[PDB]
Amino acid sequence: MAATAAEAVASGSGEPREEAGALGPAWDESQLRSYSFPTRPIPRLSQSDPRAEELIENEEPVVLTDTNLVYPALKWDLEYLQENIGNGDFSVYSASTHKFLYYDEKKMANFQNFKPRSNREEMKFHEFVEKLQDIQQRGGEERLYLQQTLNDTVGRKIVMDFLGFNWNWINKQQGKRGWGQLTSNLLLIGMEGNVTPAHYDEQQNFFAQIKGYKRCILFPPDQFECLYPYPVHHPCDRHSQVDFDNPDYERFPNFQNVVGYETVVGPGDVLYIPMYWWHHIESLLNGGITITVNFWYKGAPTPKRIEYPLKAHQKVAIMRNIEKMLGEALGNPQEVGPLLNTMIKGRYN
Amino acid sequence: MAATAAEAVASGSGEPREEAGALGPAWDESQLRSYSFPTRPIPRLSQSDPRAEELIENEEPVVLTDTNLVYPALKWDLEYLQENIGNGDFSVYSASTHKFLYYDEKKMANFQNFKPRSNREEMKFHEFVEKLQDIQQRGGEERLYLQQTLNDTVGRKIVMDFLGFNWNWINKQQGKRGWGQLTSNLLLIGMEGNVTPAHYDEQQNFFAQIKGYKRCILFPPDQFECLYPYPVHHPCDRHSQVDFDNPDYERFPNFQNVVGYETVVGPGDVLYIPMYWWHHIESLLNGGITITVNFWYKGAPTPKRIEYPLKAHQKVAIMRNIEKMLGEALGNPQEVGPLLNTMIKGRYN
Amino acid sequence: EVVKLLLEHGADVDAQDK
Amino acid sequence: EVVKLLLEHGADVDAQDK
Ligand SMILES: O=C(O)CNC(=O)C(=O)O
Ligand SMILES: O=C(O)CNC(=O)C(=O)O
Ligand SMILES: [Zn+2]
Ligand SMILES: [Zn+2]
């Protein structure tokens, strides 16, 4: 049966990997949160595998197991980083829920009724570790997620580690795919159980896992219809409105049709998250703290000649632009919706 | 009661006018078709009345009773026109229904499932009169509507009549309102009972009644929501989808909120139909043939500085442009609807 | 000038190939 | 170049005032 064969292919991140030296199962199923939708495995490949090159070229996710991208950073923990990462400020988000929904603070002026479920506090790295240690022994419920672009202020040893990254491999990827510049490296340090809810980014991403394990659930650009992003002028622009823990099928009926691609990344793994791909990222339950460094690249420019039919990501680009232009032309972002509704009701729906 | 006072103001075209020399009621109520919505009178004013100038300036409909705009054309009938209008071709529409819905023949390639309820035949003027006489004595059901832009081929007497139009008055209106050029004069010769269903035009219109009586029902640009025009790429672009004789309230719920401005124009009356105003025009039942000449002017250009909030007609302009741009960008007009729906569903509605 | 681009109008009326 | 105007993209990512 195609139905039974479908349930076989819906195998998620699959059989948990065995760590070298018989050091036991890396992780187990009970560490994964439970969701309402099926998932297919993201290919886990060698960088020298021609299939991997083909997937990156076609802008499809692949986990590369042996890039050595952040090889020198594999020795990073809280102690090493507190000693070496400098006296700069670090953005630390704090929430009472496990979900850390990103919000654009520049867009909060348009949406005054929006109240953020997380707070951003700028602190020193030793303060983050102190606040982390504080919650751990107090048995508190507060969750933290350090999310900071790595800058000038990092110390000499972090700079040295940075130099030891596999720039050869990634410079060639940037070159071959026609991408623009590297815009940032985001350091992510999360607590066990922390969730970054489904969203897409407008940049190409090499997601380099350093410490702990992250389950990454991805959705293709053509599933825009199933994922219901906030309006473009909303602070949560690019993020799904659907609560994955309790999906509102009345408001979001096509979420019943959503199908993910998932994997669990650990130390040394690099996940290619293609531009415009939805991703939901969770630090495994009871897995300890996680560390990731991403590499964000501006996408390749719009091709000289347009080909038809359009790709899913091009239609997303289009919809975004329609929303922006309408916001500007109407002089008020709040007016976009009423105009769009007026445009389709009894005309296109 | 405001409800009773509302039913008083909803007086339609009002008390039928008395023709000079006690020649009886110009028309009576039984000649008007019955519709589901209320209507308010369009002001019927002298051209020298300051209110009339104010209404045209504010782009609101007004009937001017004494312009003398087409004074020399008041002697026009079928015999006089057949004798003088030339050997040129005339577009004659033919229908089995009373409704003459305009269709863009250039847009019919996008919409192959669209079948026109009327047919265009090019003929000579004597052929139109012959075909008209043919149906009249045969007791047929076929309806004709001559609709032809007046051109080079008109004879000397029609040219002479044209010269005697009140160009002074209308040139000053064109000048004062900042309008563009006169683009055409449409001759309309319809049979009693003929209906032009609700639509708007993208030009300013002075609608000069010559023979017989027409009931004109107008709706302001802000009633776009109640009138449900076809998609912009549809042959019936700018026309209401609502069948006024049998309105589909399931498909078109806000048609229950529609409120018109109506008048009956006769020989010598000029109705200003402002650009973007919906108009439904019907030749009175058992009123004989009707003759009208319109004057179509390109609207005044987009002002240098934009003012907020936007006017209703500007939002209409905007919606039209969004539909056009999407048609072009997607490479296929049929794709506009699916993209628009995807954009709003569970996001803006 | 996106606002100006969106506010521009044509001259379409009910007359064939005009 | 309306098609090109509609196909253009920004560089927005989850990082504050970037
Ligand atoms: O790692 C996380 O929790 C979230 N990361 C991202 O969304 C990213 O790198 O694009
Ligand atoms: O007179 C008619 O039947 C229709 N006329 C118009 O739509 C017009 O002049 O704009
Ligand atoms: Zn992301
Ligand atoms: Zn018209």
What residue has token string 């919606």? Answer: B319
Residues 6+ apart with CB under 8 A from B320: B232, C9, C10
Q: Are B266 and B339 members of one domain? A: no
On whether both B140 and B88 belong to a single domain, the answer is: yes
**How far apart are the CA of A52 and the centre of ligand 3, in A?**
21
Ligand 2 pocket mutation pick from B144, B279, B290, B297 by most atoms within 8 angstroms of CB: B279
A residues 19-58 lying closer than 8 A (beta carbon) to D:
none
Q: Which two tokens stand for residue B273?
A: 């139909």
Following DSSP, what letter does each residue of A287-320 receive, concatenated? S--EEEEEEEEPPPPPPSS--SSPPHHHHHHHHH
Residue B230: CATH number of its domain: 2.60.120.10
Tell me whether residues B241 and A347 touch, CB distance under 8 A.
yes
What are the residues whose beta carbons fall under 8 Å from the beta carbon of B82, sequence distance 6 or more?
B125, B126, B129
Tell me the C-alpha distance between B201 and B218, whole Å.
12
Residue nearest to ligand 1 atom 9, measured at CA: A294
**Do A318 and A174 fall into the same domain?**
no
Which residue type, as a one-letter code, is found at position B217?
I
Structure tokens at A316: 């997303």
Query: Residue A186 forms beta bridges with which residues?
Result: A149
Residue B320 to residues A232, A319, A321, B336, Cα–Cα distance (Å): 21, 16, 16, 12
* CB contact at 8 A, B65 and B45: yes
A56 forms beta bridges with none
Bridge partner list, B331: none
User: Do B342 and B300 belong together in one domain?
Assistant: no
- CA B237, CA B108: separation in Å to the nearest integer? 11
If you count residue pairs, one on A and one on B, with CB atoms under 8 Å apart, how many are there?
95
Which one-letter amino acid corresponds to residue A261?
A: Y
Residue B339 near chain D (CB below 8 Å): no
The reply to whether B205 and B287 lie within a common domain is yes
C-alpha dihedral over B260, B45, B184, B152, to 10 degrees? Answer: 140
Give the bridge partners for A290, in sequence order.
A190
**Which residues surround ligand 2 with Cβ inside 6 Å?**
B 186, 188, 196, 201, 205, 207, 273, 279, 281, 292, 294; C 14
For residues B252 and A338, give the distance between their C-alpha atoms in angstroms, rounded to a whole number: 17
Q: How far apart are CA B283 and CA B217, in angstroms?
A: 12
DSSP string, B86-130: -S--EEEEEESSSB-----TTSTTT-TT---SEEEEEE-HHHHHH
Distance from residue A296's CA to the centre of ligand 4 (Å): 55
CB contact under 8 A, D16 and A120: yes
Of A323, A329, A341, the CB nearest to B318: A329
CATH code, domain carrying A347? 1.10.287.1010
On the 0-12 / 13-18 / 19+ scale of CB atoms within 10 A, B210 is buried
Q: Which amino acid is at A58?
A: N
- Are the beta carbons of B214 and B283 closer than 8 angstroms? yes
What is the distance in angstroms between the Cα of D1 and the nearest Cα belonging to chain A?
11
A345 shares a domain with A246:
no
Q: How far apart are the first and last CA of chain A?
A: 36
Contact B27, B264 (CB under 8 A): yes
Assess whether the C-beta atom of A147 lies below 6 angstroms from ligand 1.
Answer: no
Same domain, B195 and B46: yes
Residue with tokens 């079948």: B115
Residue B119 burial by CB count (10 A; 0-12/13-18/19+): exposed, middle or buried?
Answer: exposed
* Pair of tokens at residue B228: 């449900």
Asked whether B26 and B46 are in contact (CB, 8 A), the reply is no
Residue of B296, B297, B287, B286 whose CA lies nearest to B266: B287
Site from A321, A322, A323, A325 to mutate, C interface, most C CB atoms within 10 angstroms: A325
Residue contact D5–A321, C-beta within 8 A: yes
Tokens of A20: 């070298």
Side chain identity at residue A160, one-letter code: M
A199 and A311 housed in the same domain: no
CB atoms within 10 A of CB B251: 13
DSSP per-residue string spanning B218-254: EE-GGGHHHH-BBPTTSTTBTBB-S-TTS--TTT-GG
Which helix (H) or strand (E) covers residue B162, if one does? helix B156-163
- Closest ligand to B292 CA? 2
Q: Is D2 part of the contact surface with chain A (CB cutoff 8 Å)?
A: no
Closest chain A C-alpha to C5 CA, distance in angstroms: 9
B110-118, long-range: CB < 8 A, 24+ apart:
B110/B233, B110/B234, B110/B333, B110/B334, B111/B233, B111/B234, B111/B235, B114/B234, B114/B235, B114/B236, B116/B235, B118/B93, B118/B94, B118/B145
Plot region of C6 (φ>0 → left; ψ -120 to 50 → alpha; else → beta): alpha
Q: Which domain holds residue B321?
A: 306-349
Cα–Cα distance for residue pair B220/B209, rounded to 1 Å: 22
Q: Are residues B20 and B144 in the same domain?
A: yes
Contacts of A112 (CB under 8 A, 6+ apart): none
Residue with tokens 């289009």: A318
Round to whole Å and give the CA distance between A230 and A104.
12
Cα B58 versus chain centre, distance = 19
Tokens of B162: 């044209």
CA-based end-to-end distance of chain B: 36
Query: How are beta strands B182-184 and B118-123 bridged, if at all?
Result: unpaired
Q: What are the start-end ranges of the H helices in A178-256?
A: 224-227
Number of domains chain B is built from: 2
Does A213 share its domain with A344?
Answer: no
- Are B110 and B334 in contact by the 8 Å Cβ rule? The answer is yes
Tell me, yes or no, if D8 comes closer than 8 A to chain B by beta carbon. no
Judgement on whether residues A156 and A208 belong to the same structural domain of the protein = yes
C8 close to A (CB below 8 A): no
Give the resolution to one decimal, in Å.
Answer: 2.2
Output phi, psi for B328, to 5 deg.
-70, -45
Q: Are residues A22 and A42 in the same domain?
A: yes
Residue B327 amino acid letter: G
- The residues after which chain D has a C–N gap greater than 2.5 Å are none
Residue B311 is inside which H or E element, if any?
A: none
DSSP assigned state of A183 = E
Q: Determination method here? A: X-ray
